[PDB]
Ligand binder design. Structure first.
Ligand SMILES: Nc1ncnc2c1ncn2[C@@H]1O[C@H](COP(=O)(O)OP(=O)(O)OP(=O)(O)O)[C@@H](O)[C@H]1O
Ligand SMILES: Nc1ncnc2c1ncn2[C@@H]1O[C@H](COP(=O)(O)OP(=O)(O)O)[C@@H](O)[C@H]1O
Ligand SMILES: C=C(C)CCOP(=O)(O)OP(=O)(O)O
Ligand SMILES: C=C(C)CCOP(=O)(O)O
Lengths: 261, 239
């Protein structure tokens, strides 16, 4: 029975998603301070954001190795993501939280979606030493393909099964899960609770307005981080002291998922 | 088949006496000499002042003995990963795709030996054309909590793994001497080797040789990679 909270710092918060290689030092500094002020044992995962998505879109890194022109682009992403992780760890180090960057593209491989972690000793030993192992979204060598992209969500799934955290927190730049896109649609209302029946009901699309199933995908990503016990919270990292309050256990504006899968 | 294993020592790529001081101008030139050589290489680099300064300060070489070392070891880990990012940036600028592989995040150690239980990741990176770059770092130890792996230890592991054609050690000396060059200029230069002489000689066998070249001398590493004879120290014969 661990008392650990597994947190994901989405790339849309720690980075300016619209400006390549832009770091929101201000925001990550406050979030790290909120994590320290909470006094909770945590494990941090962060996304790539602008430190990965801008190049991955131009050279189609997600589709794998098709031409030799993506090799310099793939190497640039891995340098950018490791540089971004340095900026995240620096904020944690300044808050008295010893951590270390663990780049998945240099430790693990991928196979049809699964980020394969065959050796758990380095991460487990670093966690036993008090140095928080920080995994992040990265370009990872694939087996059936040349390279593949791992997201912060997938790094969260691996550490979730490895350490069995008591709570999972998703830190995004929005108030939570909505019935549509708030940055586009305004008629959408935040979804407060996410369960299995709502995930199954999310497959219904009478007017055919969510073809890609974005709401269903975001719901499933939260439920798979939940047990019969463990809960998952999607909180706005741009709201000052909101993550701190969530880590203290008090009620905040967020999206809660429970029940498990 | 024709790969050359090169270690960019911390004495040239950093200012060993000034903490967190990167030699950007020197590293870019060495990377340009690697690109101009046209040879397939696998680059290792040391930590220099990005590790040794804080390591000696907190006795990291002795292992985990007190809680005050854990924040120090994490600071060294961040420094080495930040130094490797600067080294990779110079490699990417020279059209050499490479990626940092921190031994403290991938492997473990036991009795002063770097243990690599999984070779698939670093090999698939080399197969993709993205040169995996290891470096001196603090690594979780199996008996001391943590330990310090050197750039030379990363060279020995990568040598037996990929079986390079040539081993080159890049430092601020012209080669091995009978004494310390900085504190003793009367020392004589050693040309061929058939304590650190056995470290170079154990990485050679049959035709593969191990060289120790001056990275501060412009175009000396380039000429060595081109096969020309330069001022250096070479081990021959094998063990
Ligand atoms: N007999 C000797 N031969 C060569 N160097 C010597 C000798 N005696 C003392 N030294 C000192 O050792 C230093 C060599 O640096 P060293 O090889 O430890 O660093 P590096 O290989 O460049 O980087 P790294 O820290 O990654 O190994 C020289 O600066 C020199 O002053
Ligand atoms: N149904 C939805 N509910 C809430 N937010 C959504 C939805 N669809 C799209 N978004 C947008 O997606 C963004 C998050 O992007 P993404 O990269 O998927 O996650 P992260 O925030 O971890 O980077 C949010 O800023 C939000 O505006
Ligand atoms: C964490 C540290 C200090 C690694 C040092 O590696 P080096 O390759 O610079 O080590 P030496 O050979 O100089 O001992
Ligand atoms: C290499 C990339 C783009 C990883 C992206 O990870 P994410 O920010 O969690 O979606």
């Amino acid at each position: 029975g661990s008392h650990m909270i597994l947190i994901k710092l989405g790339g849309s918060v720690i980075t300016d998603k619209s400006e390549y290689h832009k770091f929101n030092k201000e925001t990550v500094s406050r979030l790290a301070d909120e994590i320290r002020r909470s006094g909770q044992d945590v494990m941090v995962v962060h996304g790539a954001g602008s430190f990965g998505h801008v190049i991955a879109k131009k050279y189609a890194i997600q589709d794998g190795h098709v031409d030799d022109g993506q090799i310099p682009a793939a190497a640039r992403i891995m340098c950018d993501t490791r540089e971004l992780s340095s900026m995240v760890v620096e904020e944690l180090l300044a808050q008295g939280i010893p951590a270390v960057s663990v780049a998945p593209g240099s430790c693990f491989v991928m196979e049809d979606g699964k980020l394969i972690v065959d050796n758990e000793e380095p991460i487990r030993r670093l966690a036993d030493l008090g140095i928080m192992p920080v995994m992040f979204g990265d370009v990872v060598p694939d087996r059936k393909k040349g390279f593949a992209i791992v997201s912060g969500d997938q790094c969260m799934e691996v550490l979730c099964r490895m350490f069995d955290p008591e709570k999972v927190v998703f830190v995004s730049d929005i108030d939570g899960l909505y019935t549509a896109d708030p940055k586009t649609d305004k008629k959408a209302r935040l979804i407060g609770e996410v369960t299995r029946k709502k995930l199954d009901e999310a497959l219904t699309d009478i007017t055919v307005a969510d073809v890609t199933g974005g709401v269903h995908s975001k719901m499933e990503a939260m439920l798979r981080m939940t047990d019969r016990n463990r809960r998952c919270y999607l909180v706005n990292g741009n709201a000052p002291n909101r993550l701190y309050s969530l880590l203290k256990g008090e009620t905040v504006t967020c999206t809660v998922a429970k029940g498990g899968m």
